[PDB]
Amino acid sequence: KLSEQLKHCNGILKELLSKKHAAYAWPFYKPVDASALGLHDYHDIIKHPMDLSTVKRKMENRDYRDAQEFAADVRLMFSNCYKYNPPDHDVVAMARKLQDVFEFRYAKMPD
Ligand SMILES: CNC(=O)c1cc(C(=O)NC2CC2)n(Cc2ccccc2)n1
């Protein structure tokens, strides 16, 4: 079950990183460089940064023991975006679209 469910998670992760979703996935590829972007309040508002490169490293290192732990990091990434940004910002529209991809495929988890 656990290996099988984590392979489903790895499949989802590969899809989120694939060219298919690149138009709206790209802000989530790497850690937010707050200083580079002039977001000098980012790390005061976001206590637990998360991004797909960190999720990929954790998957590669067999850090995730189950699908629930993987999903918590993916949703933390989206939640950080919804917490920090005005809700009408382009990056929030991009987060909503990538979260739709994630949630619909995560829901197809093998039992
Ligand atoms: C996960 N990334 C973020 O939460 C984030 C927040 C921001 C940003 O500049 N937000 C403004 C309101 C202060 N940016 C830069 C960006 C990405 C896409 C399109 C335009 C700007 N990425």
Q: Which CATH class is domain 1-111?
A: mainly alpha
The burial class, CB within 10 Å (0-12 / 13-18 / 19+), for 16 is buried
Say if CB 43 and CB 34 are below 8 A apart: yes
Experimental technique of record: X-ray
Query: Which residue out of 28, 30, 37 has the highest number of ligand 1 atoms within 8 Å of its CB and is therefore the one to mutate?
Result: 37
The burial class, CB within 10 Å (0-12 / 13-18 / 19+), for 47 is exposed
Q: Is the CB of 49 under 6 A from ligand 1?
A: no
User: What's the CA-to-centroid distance between 62 and ligand 1, angstroms?
Assistant: 30
Say if CB 84 and CB 46 are below 8 A apart: yes
Q: Where are the domains of the chain?
A: 1-111
Spell out the alpha helix ranges (H) of 17-86.
22-25, 34-37, 42-45, 52-60, 67-84
The burial class, CB within 10 Å (0-12 / 13-18 / 19+), for 70 is buried
